[PDB]
Amino acid sequence: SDHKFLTQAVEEAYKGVDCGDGGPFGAVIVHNNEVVASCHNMVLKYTDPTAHAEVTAIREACKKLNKIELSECEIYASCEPCPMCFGAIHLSRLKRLVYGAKAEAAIAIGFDDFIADALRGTGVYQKSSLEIKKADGNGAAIAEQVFQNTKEKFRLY
Amino acid sequence: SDHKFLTQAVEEAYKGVDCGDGGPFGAVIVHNNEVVASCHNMVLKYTDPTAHAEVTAIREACKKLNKIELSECEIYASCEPCPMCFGAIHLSRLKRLVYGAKAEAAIAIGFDDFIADALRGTGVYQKSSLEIKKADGNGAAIAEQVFQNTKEKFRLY
Numbered sequence: 001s002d003h004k005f006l007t008q009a010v011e012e013a014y015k016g017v018d019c020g021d022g023g024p025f026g027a028v029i030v031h032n033n034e035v036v037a038s039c040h041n042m043v044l045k046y047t048d049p050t051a052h053a054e055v056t057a058i059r060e061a062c063k064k065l066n067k068i069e070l071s072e073c074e075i076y077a078s079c080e081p082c083p084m085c086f087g088a089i090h091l092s093r094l095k096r097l098v099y100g101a102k103a104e105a106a107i108a109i110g111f112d113d114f115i116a117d118a119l120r121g122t123g124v125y126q127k128s129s130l131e132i133k134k135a136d137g138n139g140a141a142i143a144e145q146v147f148q149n150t151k152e153k154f155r156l157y
Numbered sequence: 158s159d160h161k162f163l164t165q166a167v168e169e170a171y172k173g174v175d176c177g178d179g180g181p182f183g184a185v186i187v188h189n190n191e192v193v194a195s196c197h198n199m200v201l202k203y204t205d206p207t208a209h210a211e212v213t214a215i216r217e218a219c220k221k222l223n224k225i226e227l228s229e230c231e232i233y234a235s236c237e238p239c240p241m242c243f244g245a246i247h248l249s250r251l252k253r254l255v256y257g258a259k260a261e262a263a264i265a266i267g268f269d270d271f272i273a274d275a276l277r278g279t280g281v282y283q284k285s286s287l288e289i290k291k292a293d294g295n296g297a298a299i300a301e302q303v304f305q306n307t308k309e310k311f312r313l314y
């Protein structure tokens with residue numbers, strides 16, 4: 001099921017790039033095995049630099065469930081969440097994060113070197129408690145491939 | 158000019174907590190002495206845990222100016238921005254941050270112990286070169302007192 005929902009987050013990344021909504025990033029939020037939100041980056045569509053895939057998914061999930069905490073939910077991110085997104089995941093109280101590509105994969109095609117210490121376990125003032133899984137094998141291959149496949153199919157930001 | 162806009166952010170904090178929109182946090186975004194957005198925390202009003210004051214102000218300012226970078230703007234935060242908000246400030250390309258109260262003043266009334274390494278210069282992966290000013294003297298004292306003053310008017314969320 002991890003592979004199914006991570007692959008859906010990657011699909012979201014491709015769709016968002018395809019329609020010009022934003023960059024190649026997707027996020028899926030699930031309650032057990034029911035998708036509560038499925039989103040991609042909306043920075044260009046919304047004229048909103050906070051509208052990353054993960055933030056968008058968190059907003060949509062909180063609306064869908066009518067509350068500001070998602071402690072029964074897990075999030076799948078096609079790419080390692082940035083410091084803004086990882087902070088949002090902390091505030092939302094999501095209980096588990098599974099992510100596909102390491103941040104360096106996005107850096108390699110032109111995005112900011114902008115990495116969350118709290119996710120990598122090097123934070124001093126910010127310490128995470130949630131369970132974090134970096135995908136391997138086929139999930140990692142798919143997630144990494146996103147950046148080579150979508151290179152110069154969108155406008156960087 | 159710094160004292161005027163910091164005071165505006167503090168007044169936003171009181172206004173938001175008084176009408177129930179969210180916690181006692183305010184933020185004002187300015188473009189060469191013209192206010193672009195003046196906002197407070199809307200987590201409760203919006204059912205959105207990402208709707209901190211700073212994030213809300215960035216959303217509003219970017220939509221107003223029809224662009225996703227605010228590189229000619231500065232942001233005044235009644236309180237030291239959290240990891241999520243500092244990440245949003247970084248992504249938005251705001252050129253300067255002035256903040257009133259240290260994060261410990263909010264933590265002292267029960268908010269999350271949740272502090273941005275990149276703001277305090279304590280990260281391995283996340284750096285900032287953003288121009289950052291912690292206010293001092295008069296407006297700093299006032300900003301610090303926001304939390305003791307509003308402790309009773311809202312319930313931690």
Ligand SMILES: C[n+]1cn([C@@H]2O[C@H](CO)[C@@H](O)[C@H]2O)c2nc(N)[nH]c(=O)c21
Binds near residue numbers: 082114
């Ligand atoms: C819109 N966007 C930009 N980056 C950028 O990817 C790099 C590595 O994380 C960082 O530069 C971050 O800002 C995003 N990252 C994720 N995980 N999701 C997004 O929507 C996103």
Ligand SMILES: C[n+]1cn([C@@H]2O[C@H](CO)[C@@H](O)[C@H]2O)c2nc(N)[nH]c(=O)c21
Binds near residue numbers: 237
């Ligand atoms: C809704 N909210 C919660 N915190 C809390 O602030 C602490 C760190 O400063 C953290 O405990 C965080 O949860 C907020 N902080 C600011 N600056 N602005 C907000 O709108 C906000």
Ligand SMILES: [Zn+2]
Binds near residue numbers: 052053054082083
């Ligand atoms: Zn992000």
Ligand SMILES: [Zn+2]
Binds near residue numbers: 210238239242
């Ligand atoms: Zn914040």
